[PDB]
Paper text:
Plectasin consists of 40 amino acids and shows well-defined secondary structural elements in form of an α-helix (M13-S21) and an antiparallel β-sheet (G28-A31; V36-C39). The structure of plectasin is stabilized by three disulfide bridges (C4-C30; C15-C37; C19-C39), which is typical for this type of defensins and leads to high conformational stability. Plectasin contains a cysteine-stabilised α-helix-β-sheet structure, which remains intact upon fibril formation. We have determined the structure, kinetics, and functionality associated with the pH-responsive self-assembly of the enhanced plectasin variant PPI42 into helical protein fibrils.
To elucidate the structural features that allow PPI42 to assemble into fibrils, while the plectasin wildtype did not fibrillate, we determined the crystal structure of the plectasin wildtype at a resolution of 1.1 Å. Our plectasin wildtype structure shows a high similarity to the published crystal structure (PDBID: 3E7U69) with only minor differences in the N-terminal loop (all-atom RMSD: 0.316 Å). When we compared our wildtype plectasin crystal structure to the fibril cryo-EM structure of PPI42, we observed a significant structural difference in the N-terminal loop region between amino acids 9 and 14. Two of these  positions are mutated in PPI42 (D9S; Q14K). We observed a network of polar interactions in the plectasin wildtype with (D9) forming a salt bridge to (N5). When mutated to (S9) in PPI42, the sidechain orientation changes and the sidechain forms a hydrogen bond to the (G6) backbone, which disrupts the network stabilizing this part of the N-terminal loop. In the plectasin wildtype, (H18) is coordinated in two different ways (50/50% distribution) stabilized by polar interaction with (Q14) and π-stacking with (F2), while in PPI42 only the π-stacking with (F2) occurs due to the mutation Q14K. Notably, the sidechains of (E10), (D11), and (D12) form intermolecular interfaces both in the protein crystal of the wildtype and in the fibril of PPI42. However, their orientation differs significantly between wildtype and PPI42. This structural difference may contribute to the different arrangement with the mutant forming the fibril and the wildtype forming the crystal.
Author numbering: 1 to 40
The structure:
Amino acid sequence: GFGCNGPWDEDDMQCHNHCKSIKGYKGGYCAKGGFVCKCY
């Protein structure tokens, strides 16, 4: 989710921007075949 909707729509930028607005995080990427937004 959060932009990471699998191979038909793997929107790393959307996930990154979700994550970046969470206190303590700086970015994010799609993981697990495109289906999971992982924040870091």
